[PDB]
Amino acid sequence: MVEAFCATWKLTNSQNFDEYMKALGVGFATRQVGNVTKPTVIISQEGDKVVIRTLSTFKNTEISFQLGEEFDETTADDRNCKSVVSLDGDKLVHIQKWDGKETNFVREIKDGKMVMTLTFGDVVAVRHYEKA
């Protein structure tokens, strides 16, 4: 359930994130920062909402949503999206739509770590976080 994700998480390892950022339209200079930054992600429940707060030396973001309910999201890379997060089995699936495009992030708990799999088209990146 959602409670399994409710913790403070710190990024430890990213796989193929440069190509993923490039596919999304992030420029070279910003990709260099994105490839070294290791954010902290705080996930919590507040009433009927789930809150995901990302803290980093690049940008800080926060989204608050109800599962299954579409919301407006302005992403850290400055895309204005329509987003929907659902709990599919034991995984949180976040679908972001903008400018006729779509990307998705799947968050799962695997062996006690949070694993985030990001897909845009045929480009897949994987980000691994440890509980702090």
Swiss-Prot record:
The keyword Acetylation applies. GO terms for biological process: epithelial cell proliferation; fatty acid transport; negative regulation of cell population proliferation; nervous system development. Pfam families: Lipocalin (PF00061). Keywords: Acetylation, Cytoplasm, Lipid-binding, Transport. The modification N-acetylvaline is found at V2. Expressed in brain and other neural tissues. It comes from the Eukaryota. GO terms for cellular component: cytosol; nucleus. A fatty acid binds at R127, H128, Y129. GO terms for molecular function: fatty acid binding; lipid binding. It is found in: Cytoplasm. Forms a beta-barrel structure that accommodates the hydrophobic ligand in its interior. Belongs to the calycin superfamily. Fatty-acid binding protein (FABP) family. B-FABP could be involved in the transport of a so far unknown hydrophobic ligand with potential morphogenic activity during CNS development. It is required for the establishment of the radial glial fiber system in developing brain, a system that is necessary for the migration of immature neurons to establish cortical layers. This is Fatty acid-binding protein, brain. It comes from Homo sapiens.
